[PDB]
Amino acid sequence: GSSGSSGEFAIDPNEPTYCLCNQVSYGEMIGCDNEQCPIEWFHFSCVSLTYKPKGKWYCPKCRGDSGPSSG
Ligand SMILES: [Zn+2]
Ligand SMILES: [Zn+2]
């Protein structure tokens, strides 16, 4: 990558986005065990991850579904 350049937190229309922060893949990323998941791609730092977990990892968007807006 680039040694260092100001102007972070920017989403370019050139490259797509997956992670929740909607940013271009970078650093370490894992594939949500849930295939159906349209993202199946999230950053570590974002998902408070230090290293590839030796266990099924389900994005915070899948594991948290129960609970509809209205009752
Ligand atoms: Zn992210
Ligand atoms: Zn998922």
Swiss-Prot record:
Zn(2+) 2 binds at residues 32, 37, 59, 62. Signal peptide: none annotated. A zinc finger (PHD-type) spans 16-65. The record marks 18, 29, 33, 41 as: Histone H3K4me3 binding. Zn(2+) 1 binds at residues 19, 21, 43, 46. It is found in: Nucleus. It comes from the Eukaryota. Sumoylation enhances its association with SIN3A and is required for binding to some target gene promoters, this is the case for TMEM71. Interacts with H3K4me3 and to a lesser extent with H3K4me2. Component of a mSin3A-like complex at least consisting of SIN3A, HDAC1, HDAC2, RBBP4/RbAp48, RBBP7/RbAp46, SAP30 and ING2. The PHD-type zinc finger mediates the binding to H3K4me3. The polybasic region (PBR) is responsive to the binding to phosphoinositides (PtdInsPs), including phosphatidylinositol 5-phosphate (PtdIns(5)P). Seems to be involved in p53/TP53 activation and p53/TP53-dependent apoptotic pathways, probably by enhancing acetylation of p53/TP53. Component of a mSin3A-like corepressor complex, which is probably involved in deacetylation of nucleosomal histones. ING2 activity seems to be modulated by binding to phosphoinositides (PtdInsPs). Belongs to the ING family. This is Inhibitor of growth protein 2. It comes from Mus musculus (Mouse). The chain holds residues 205 to 262 of 281 of the full protein.
